[PDB]
């Protein structure tokens, strides 16, 4: 196939162009709602943590696939491992609200706590980049899912439910230094 | 809109008065039955405690929203954390009835105990204020939901079920000392 390149129209040639045959494909695993629905770690927890999804690792599965979109919407699930009770306040709450049990408070069971949180931001969508400020490198302070608090939190996991992504951005792979391709060890049985 | 003020009739102007448009509203969160249905703390527990809802903190969510009504009706749920067994006697019972196991007695399981209690007061409604006395600042002694007893009680939580409020009263906010508005810290992600 030949076409006008500078017009930027999408062109999809087939193997039928020289006698081949396009085969049936199944793309269940690259579905946006499917791939973002797994628990991923948040490796900076405090006694008080504000749930911000831009704190996932930038090279993880969900972390990187979230950096590869401009806007997003999602509910949330969290798995917290804490001592004492765990208080959650929604988006917009004072920081002093986290010391009272009128808010969602979880009395700790043995292994950990697994909750489901809604989307409470005042905006229709959240963003991973922001060109500018919001007061009178840093996103607006209203780009969060709430805050949690315990006497000490050991680990935090998050999961995106009903995820929707908009306006894709670059997504990079590890760079090849001098090789012909990036070679690494792949699992193979012993002996 | 202009009206006679001293007549005390309610007046609701709209933004349509100068070309605007009244938007659709959802008031599910300021529903009386919805907002009063959360566990709230009772921070003065004894070996013997008489369940009186006017012992909730006056500035909590449920505590303050209950002080903002003259009369009320409700069932109850309690979460008690005790040592030994927990006896409950209804409204009107002798204090010596609390030492016998013919009354509702809960043999303690591991974390705590969660029960549901009915409304047993002899009146149609209970009140938060009373102008006068009841014998021949202090409410009548029949304004309670019963009593509990254990060897020592560590914490008590209560929850109002099927709540009904009547005759609203003033509900205040924290006062602003000298500012233009009350400024406080609001949750925002780190970095």
């Amino acid at each position, epitope marked *: 196939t030949t076409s006008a390149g500078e017009s930027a129209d999408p062109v999809t040639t087939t193997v039928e162009n020289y006698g081949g045959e396009t085969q049936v494909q199944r793309r269940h695993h690259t579905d946006v709602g499917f791939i973002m629905d797994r628990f991923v770690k948040i490796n900076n927890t405090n006694p008080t943590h504000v749930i911000d999804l831009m704190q996932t690792h930038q090279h993880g599965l969900v972390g990187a696939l979230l950096r590869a979109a401009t806007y997003y919407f999602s509910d949330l699930e969290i798995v917290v491992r804490h001592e004492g009770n765990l208080t959650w306040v929604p988006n917009g709450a004072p920081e002093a609200a986290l010391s009272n049990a009128g808010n969602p408070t979880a009395y700790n069971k043995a292994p950990f706590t697994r909750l489901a949180l809604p989307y409470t931001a005042p905006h229709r969508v959240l963003a991973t980049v922001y060109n500018g400020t919001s007061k009178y490198t840093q996103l607006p302070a209203s780009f969060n899912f709430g805050a949690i608090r315990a006497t*000490d939190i050991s680990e935090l996991l998050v999961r995106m439910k009903r995820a929707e992504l908009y306006c894709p951005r670059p997504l990079l792979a590890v760079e090849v230094t001098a090789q012909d391709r990036h070679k690494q060890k792949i699992i193979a049985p012993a002996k | 809109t202009t009206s006679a003020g001293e007549s005390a009739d309610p007046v609701t102007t709209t933004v349509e008065n100068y070309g605007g448009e009244t938007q659709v509203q959802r008031r599910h969160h300021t529903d009386v039955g919805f907002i009063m249905d959360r566990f709230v*703390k009772i921070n003065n527990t004894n070996p013997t405690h008489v369940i009186d809802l006017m012992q909730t903190h006056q500035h909590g969510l449920v505590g303050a929203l209950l002080r903002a009504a003259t009369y009320y009706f409700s069932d109850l749920e309690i979460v008690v954390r005790h040592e030994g067994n927990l006896t409950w006697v209804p409204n009107g019972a002798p204090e010596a009835a609390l030492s016998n196991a013919g009354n509702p007695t809960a043999y303690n399981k591991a974390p705590f105990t969660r029960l549901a209690l009915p409304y047993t007061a002899p009146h149609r409604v209970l009140a938060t204020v009373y102008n006068g006395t009841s014998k021949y600042t202090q409410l009548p002694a029949s304004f309670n939901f019963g009593a509990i007893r254990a060897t020592d009680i*560590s914490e008590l939580l209560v929850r109002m079920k099927r709540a009904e409020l009547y005759c609203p009263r003033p509900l205040l906010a924290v006062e602003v000392t000298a500012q233009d508005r009350h400024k406080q810290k609001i949750i925002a992600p780190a970095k």
Partner: nanobody
Amino acid sequence: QVQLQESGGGLVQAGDSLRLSCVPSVRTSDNYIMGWFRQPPGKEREFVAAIRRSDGTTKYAASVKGRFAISRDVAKNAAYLQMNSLKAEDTAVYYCAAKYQSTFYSTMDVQYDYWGQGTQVTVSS
């Protein structure tokens, strides 16, 4: 998680009074039990007095029962150990502690979680 800030230590002589204070760093909604442990010179740590956060249920040691008094401030989230009529034996290193995990009276002096660095109280004669 939680760090404890102690205040009010120093030096006195026999017959006077001292006031120790301790405020935790976070104000979580738990039922923690603030207590006081003391370690005399050349001896091991021991319990002095504890108090529950919900009510004012106070434990004490046989040594200091009528002299010492412990209280809590619901507003400022503090606890105070009012030491009275000190004896020359009251010279020690006084530690506070937290005990968040369980809040029953019978175990109110056995297993605390966060200590916080101790204060020095050296009474003279």
